[model samples]
Target: CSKNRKAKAKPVTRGTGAGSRPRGQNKERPPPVPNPDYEPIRKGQRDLYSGLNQRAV
Candidate 1:
């Protein structure tokens, strides 16, 4: 693989901690977790939003 054509690093799939917030906004506790009743989580969700933000990655 070319040195310049490096593989993209995956977006943060986990939390930094309970206190760390996403960017400018300060969240109290990672957005109240996801509703367990739901299956196969998708983009725009609390879990996947971080990945979606990395468009050019």
Candidate 2:
């Protein structure tokens, strides 16, 4: 008879994202995780920048 004696170690990723892979991360650190404040892609986000000119928009 045999018994399981050891727990498996989950792989520790050095970084996240496909771009964070060895080749990409080789040049720089991976982009940090996004935050809720991120609204560049959100609709009406430009409304907040309305005070500035289109160049700043």
Candidate 3:
């Protein structure tokens, strides 16, 4: 014979990277939660108006 009583809530999300899913200032909240100092790839970040003016010396 077995008895199992339960209170369960499963909040599941795998992404929303580092800041983990949050949004407010509702305009039906469609296009937000992507502004954590927005960047995709800025690895060596230099573009002071083009290629450092190319110098091989």
Candidate 4:
């Protein structure tokens, strides 16, 4: 306690500090099941570049 001061909220580790995305953050998501509806699932993915613009319109 004789070094620095007021570093209680610095860019600390864990929880939400300096947490970069596109990694393990989604590694354990509860939504991994994603869409329970296979109809919507296939329709959505198949239309990404096909004729699946149903959701967009």
Candidate 5:
């Protein structure tokens, strides 16, 4: 007897690129850096999560 489980897709990421698992197995991947906005508001975001708003581009 066996069971089948389908995986769910994650929402779009804000970092450099998407993440993928090796050999379709459960493996951990490197974490993504802060969103692109982090650079523009580097100071504020350092202390607070909602300190800076993402830029519109």
Candidate 6:
């Protein structure tokens, strides 16, 4: 038992390394294309001063 040797721990190179941003990186970058001119202006026409723009009182 020549002094019972036991020492071995030097290998923990965890993730996110070397120019890393590619774990499902935009597969083709064309998946969220549904704007279709998005004509949704109805909420008091997006505030001209809000409060229904004052119509009667």
Sorted on TM-score, best first, the list reads 6, 5, 3, 1, 4, 2
Candidate 5 lDDT over residue span 1-57, tens digit each: 001112212212223133552234344354443344333332222323343455552
Candidate 2 Cα outliers beyond 4 Å, as residue runs: 1-42, 51-57
Model 3 per-residue lDDT tens digits across residues 1-57:
001111111112222233643433344434434343344332333343354467862
**What lDDT is reached at residue 28 by model 4?**
43
lDDT value, residue 2 of candidate 4:
9
2 or 6: which has the higher TM-score? 6
Q: Distance from true position, residue 45, model 6, in Å?
A: 2.8
Q: What is the lDDT of candidate 2?
A: 0.30
Residue 57 of model 3 has an lDDT of 28
Query: Model 1: clashing residue pairs?
Result: none
RMSD to the native, candidate 2? 17.8
Where in model 1 is the C-alpha error above 4 Å? 1-45, 55-57
State, as a TM-score between 0 and 1, how close model 3 is to the true structure.
Answer: 0.16
Per-residue error for 21 in candidate 5, Å, reads 3.0
lDDT of each: 0.37, 0.30, 0.31, 0.31, 0.29, 0.31
Clashing pairs in 2: none
Candidate 1: tens digits of C-alpha lDDT, residues 1-57 = 111222112223543343543243243444444443244332233666565678777
Poorest lDDT segment (10 consecutive residues) of candidate 3: 1-10
Model 2: per-residue Cα lDDT at residue 16: 19
What's every prediction's RMSD, in angstroms?
A: 15.9, 17.8, 19.0, 18.9, 14.6, 26.0
Better of 3 and 4 by TM-score: 3
Worst 10 residues of 6 by lDDT: 1-10
| lDDT score, candidate 3, position 54 | 78
Q: Which stretches of candidate 4 lie over 4 Å from their true place?
A: 1-27, 40-57
